[PDB]
């Protein structure tokens, strides 16, 4: 059911999505091990992800969460990186895209920092890196991220350095509490709480 629509870089919708991508890059405590060394991306393509079935699945759930939370979906646009981006855009999110070993439990994880999600493009800890060169910091190979609509609803705050939600809540927010530059990270426990709206194709760029 899915079809992908290119946006022109002249479109304002492309620009703002790129802006979110570029402006949420940060340094990472692993020195660049997982996701590579870079301060910004070369954006190659941005595509709107259109799937009626998956969209209705998502809004049906949103209406449920909103009605459980004083008419407040608490909807966000967050980044997701995953070896299964192609599956995700054709079949949507489910328990097979959960991060089983994640710090907030087995769930689908999302980031405010694009560079956080970029660490998961080739797998956990960056895996063995790009398939062609086995290089976690490859500047050549094309990477892909999803920018997603995510219904957090009532989010359980966890301060820090497929399962269920903690009862009474629809998601978990990983409020970062050591690194003063790191943004929040979020976890949902049902695929229906995210829609993979944009497929961003990019290369990380070697710093000057
Ligand atoms: C292979 C698999 O099960 C898997 C796939 C993707 C991630 C992932 N984790 C995150 C954690 C925090 C913030 C963003 C992300 C993020 O964008 N992706 C984790 C595991
Ligand atoms: Zn490569």
Swiss-Prot record:
The chain holds residues 952 to 1161 of 1166 of the full protein. This is Poly [ADP-ribose] polymerase tankyrase-2. It is found in: Cytoplasm; Golgi apparatus membrane; Nucleus; Chromosome, Telomere. Oligomerizes and associates with TNKS. Interacts with the cytoplasmic domain of LNPEP/Otase in SLC2A4/GLUT4-vesicles. Binds to the N-terminus of Grb14 and TRF1 with its ankyrin repeat region. Interacts with HIF1AN. Interacts with RNF146; this interaction leads to ubiquitination and proteasomal degradation. Interacts with NUMA1. Belongs to the ARTD/PARP family. Zn(2+) binds at residues 130, 133, 138, 141. It comes from the Eukaryota. It comes from Homo sapiens. The gene is TNKS2. Ubiquitinated at 'Lys-48' and 'Lys-63' by RNF146 when auto-poly-ADP-ribosylated; this leads to degradation. Deubiquitinated by USP25; leading to stabilization. ADP-ribosylated (-auto). Poly-ADP-ribosylated protein is recognized by RNF146, followed by ubiquitination. Poly-ADP-ribosyltransferase involved in various processes such as Wnt signaling pathway, telomere length and vesicle trafficking. Acts as an activator of the Wnt signaling pathway by mediating poly-ADP-ribosylation of AXIN1 and AXIN2, 2 key components of the beta-catenin destruction complex: poly-ADP-ribosylated target proteins are recognized by RNF146, which mediates their ubiquitination and subsequent degradation. Also mediates poly-ADP-ribosylation of BLZF1 and CASC3, followed by recruitment of RNF146 and subsequent ubiquitination. Highly expressed in placenta, skeletal muscle, liver, brain, kidney, heart, thymus, spinal cord, lung, peripheral blood leukocytes, pancreas, lymph nodes, spleen, prostate, testis, ovary, small intestine, colon, mammary gland, breast and breast carcinoma, and in common-type meningioma. Highly expressed in fetal liver, heart and brain. Residues 8-208 form the PARP catalytic domain.
